[PDB]
Nucleic acid binder design. Structure first.
Ligand SMILES: [Zn+2]
Lengths: 156, 100
RNA sequence: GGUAAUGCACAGUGAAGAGGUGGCAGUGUGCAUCUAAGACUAAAUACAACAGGAGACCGAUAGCAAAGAAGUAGGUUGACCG
RNA sequence: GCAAGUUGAGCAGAGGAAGUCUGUGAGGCGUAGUGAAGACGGAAAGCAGUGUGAGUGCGACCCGAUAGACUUGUGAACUAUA
RNA sequence: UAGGGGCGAAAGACCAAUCGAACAGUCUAGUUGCUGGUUCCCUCCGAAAUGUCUAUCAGGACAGCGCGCACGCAGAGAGAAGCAAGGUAGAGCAUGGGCCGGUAUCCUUAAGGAGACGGACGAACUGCGAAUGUGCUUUUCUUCUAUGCAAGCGUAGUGGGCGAGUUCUGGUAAGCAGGACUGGCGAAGAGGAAUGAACCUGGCACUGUGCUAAGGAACCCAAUGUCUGGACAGAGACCGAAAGA
RNA sequence: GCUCGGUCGUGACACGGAGGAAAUGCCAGAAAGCACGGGUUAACGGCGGGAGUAACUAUGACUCUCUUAAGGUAGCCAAACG
RNA sequence: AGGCGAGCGCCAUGAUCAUCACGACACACUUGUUUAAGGACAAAGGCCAGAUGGGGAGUUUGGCUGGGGCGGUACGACCACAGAAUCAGAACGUGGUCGACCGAAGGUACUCACAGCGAGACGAGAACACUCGUGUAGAGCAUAAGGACUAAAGAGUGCCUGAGUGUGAGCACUACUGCUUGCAUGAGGGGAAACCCGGGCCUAGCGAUCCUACGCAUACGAGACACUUGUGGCGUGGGUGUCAGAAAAGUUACCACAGGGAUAACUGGCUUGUGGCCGCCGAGCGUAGAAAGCGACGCGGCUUUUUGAUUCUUCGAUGUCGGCUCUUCCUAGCAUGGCCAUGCAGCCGUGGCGAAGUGUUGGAUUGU
RNA sequence: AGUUACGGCCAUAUCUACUGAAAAACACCGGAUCCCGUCCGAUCUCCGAAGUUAAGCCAAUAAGAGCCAUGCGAGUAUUAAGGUGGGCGACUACUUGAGAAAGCGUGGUGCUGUAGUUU
């Protein structure tokens, strides 16, 4: 039978990668955080204070409050077939800034131009949506340089 | 476990750090005049047998170390709790490193 | 219910003429309220047998066990049973 | 139904009457909360009925133990021993 | 001589067809987490055999899944597009464990040992690493959507499950014991596998005309024939191994 | 287990003592029992292991060693007891 | 009121109240010695208190479990493995550990490594102390297992008792418990300072209501007022290992009751380890010679006639071992009939093939 | 254009042999009186310039070891969905999709930020 301590089953998780042992780099400490940013959790096994519980490893959430050397992040979780919000305390050594909003922020920068012109000249924005890839395109071909294919390889 | 007989620490009444005297807490004698003692005496009185349960299936070996510390200036007291230990000594000789 | 004794008893002990009480043990002191250890008392309250009047009750496998010579015919060694 | 209020408490007055009508008049819950308490104070329509679903206590949807106790109730016509 | 009492040449024998504690009557309609039963029609919706705690394991309670009444309302058991985490299958044998053999060379012996290397390996070896599955953001992202979702309040049943396909652990195995994932029977009829809870087709108000599925087409039994190769064994259509002429 | 003898200690309530305004506590005191010393199996019952050693081989009268409250005598047996 | 030893305790005897034996009388009490004998003792009653007490009375004698019992603990905690690469995830599945220990093995600041291997240095050897060069951890880190750590978290050296005090918010399926983190304060610590510290490098070493002991200030107190006792509030200790927490020994072959095929003792079904029977290969043996007859070391099957393994059907009942009697079936063929091989001269045999028509007995010991 | 002080990403920067280097630096170097610390001015701390490019730091070289990239291995190994496909099993063919690793070949061998100094 299995046990139920705070760091159960973390032999693979919570171990350093090959040729990457030691303390964190300066960039870790010089990064500034703000309320409302999206942030991503990855535990560093060498630091023993401010570690989250291993369920949260590799998950992304939103910063709710900022303190001297730690952050409070909001998560959601299913328990007993219902949704529950959870507020997780994490030290700054175990977090990295998330990339999940990157494309959306670029798109907002384009929208922000159009939405002004749409008051002056038009009435409503064109709004620049994405579209999924359509059907295969048409082609005009010169028809020299033909290559033949054959079952010449007998494959003993 | 070895404990020194003196400890400089914060005194709540004096509101600054002071010298304290350190010793093991002592369990005092039960009083017949309290409400629980009075109730039990009356209930036991007749031909009623044993009227309250007594524990028999006991299981623990140690009990928790508890220190009483007294402020030398104002005689106020604080209670400090230290966990379970089979044996305790006050003011013995230091555990000097690098013995023969 | 009466909680460091609410009431009642038994054995030891046992008052004062002045005493008893004021929902928590003790000692003192004012204050308030009563008078135990002798007796009597109506009305307003409770409920069988027996009599009278009523009912959104039951209608002969129901309603009392029993709408006729029913605690009967009949039964237990007996108490009792039907 | 009435509404910052609400109510068939008991009981009295009238009446050819176990119905109905009218008084007098408590109490309870509500009109704002916090603490063991001393103490303090600053949001949120309720009361009484007629019924339905559902919890708890009483035989408790219907039938069913082996047992326990109590009587100033009965038995040695069978069988044991003097 | 009488019931927690009698009487016994002792068997727990006998005390009115009753005795390892009599009979009568009452308390009493004693108690029951256990067995049996529980009385009219149609319409609409529709489960669970799991988790935590229990002198708990044939029982409870709390939560999860039904139904009724519903204030209200931009959502979704599906994809894309950016982004994270993972150490299984495969592949390998660089730290650790560990099998067999080595040329030149080296060390001694005149034996053996070491060896520039090759072959064989681990659920508790890893230097590399999938597919499938999981989460985050965006409707400023395709596609659907009101005969739809639904906070809140009140209250039921359930808490012995079993089986198929894909996989796993214990065991010589088992119509054996125990988990995980996606649909079933339970609570599911109809047509087909001759027959069969779960397999194939495919989800049921009540009628009438046409068409197809799965499976069939000498006869039983509604619909059958054609072409080309094999095969001679009371064989096959239903059916067992290593080894063989 | 039963029985006999003494206290050296413990061991109740009462009866005393000290103190305090008083209650509650504290101290002393303390029979029989218990503890301690003897008796008792036609009382309940109980009654051992290991090594060497004799002019063929075997066996061990003999020796050594561990152990106790005492280490199964006289008899009897694959017996209704192997 | 006397006496002793440098007014003290100790030794003399004289007044004041109980009081334990012993005598001698008769009045309570006792006895048919009754015109009598005993006698304040006995015997008989009463109220409290100790001792003894299966003679009796009430009651109890946990759970899980390939049926129960005996055994283990899968009953409260911790690490690793597996459970088809998030998390979760069963079995009396696998390898183990816990109920503690430590004034430093706690807090801080600085210095420097280690295990080994190759050269050296008298006694001095395999193994003594000191040096030089290499050295990614091959060492250590009190105590399981995993993770972590290198001008350190390891080894030394200095100083300190933060193993402070009030009061909030959260994470692990979250009550208890453990940990993370906010603000305010200390005539707080260490460090030049930035920084760090409210126990142990991280994941384990632990426990409610009521009662009781101690610490802390603020409350209550009955018609009034003072004090000795008492009652409230917050926080810690004393403990429930069956660990979300009753106060608890056996036996029934004399036995009762409610139920159970949720579960054993027959048969049947599935399986075939064990039991029995058959094949394949050819090392050796047979007077020569693999194979007349044998056939090691290995490998593949069939049977249900042995015994296991499992619990699907039956507990408001399917009569349980052996013998007697009587019938039918199977073949893996003991005799009887036809054949083939031979290490078949003949006689007697041995190995094989088609074949189940007819036969296969009488007794002694024993329930068999 | 190098160097030097303080850095960023942490081997294209490591490890082993050899060789070069104008200027200004960077060093080795000369002492211990004091402050400070050692069994020991070796290290650490202080006060100095008589020497020297020998060393370090910087740069080049090597069919170098190791690291980084890319091609091939290879549509190979494994795998999602499907059928009254096959096989006594052990396992495996086909249809619509996703898709490796080791080895071995070829090329590389630090790049940059702020300030100071030197033709
Ligand atoms: Zn003080």
């Amino acid at each position: 039978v299995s046990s139920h301590g705070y760091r159960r089953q973390t032999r693979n998780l919570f171990s350093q990668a090959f040729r990457k042992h030691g303390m964190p780099n300066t960039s870790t400490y010089l990064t500034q955080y703000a309320v409302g940013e999206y942030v991503d959790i990855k535990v560093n096994p060498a630091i023993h204070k401010g570690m989250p519980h291993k369920y949260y490893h590799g998950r992304t959430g939103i910063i709710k409050e900022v303190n001297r050397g730690s952050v409070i992040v909001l998560f959601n979780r299913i328990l007993a077939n219902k949704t529950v919000e959870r507020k997780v305390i994490v030290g700054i050594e175990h977090i990295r800034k998330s990339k999940c909003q990157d494309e959306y922020l670029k798109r907002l920068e384009i929208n922000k131009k159009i939405i002004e012109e749409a008051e002056k000249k038009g009435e409503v924005p064109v709004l620049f949506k994405r579209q999924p890839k359509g059907p295969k395109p048409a082609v005009e071909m010169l028809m020299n340089n033909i290559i033949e294919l054959s079952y010449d390889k007998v494959e003993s | 476990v070895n404990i020194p007989k003196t400890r400089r620490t914060y005194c709540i009444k004096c509101a600054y750090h002071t010298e304290f005297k350190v010793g093991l807490l002592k369990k005092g004698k039960d009083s017949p005049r309290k409400q629980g003692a009075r109730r039990y005496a009356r209930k036991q009185r007749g031909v009623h047998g044993q009227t309250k349960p007594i524990l028999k299936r006991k299981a623990k070996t140690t009990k928790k170390v508890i220190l009483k510390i007294e402020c030398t200036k104002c005689k106020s007291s604080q209670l400090k709790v230290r966990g379970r230990a089979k044996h305790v000594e006050f003011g013995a000789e230091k555990k000097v490193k690098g013995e023969a």
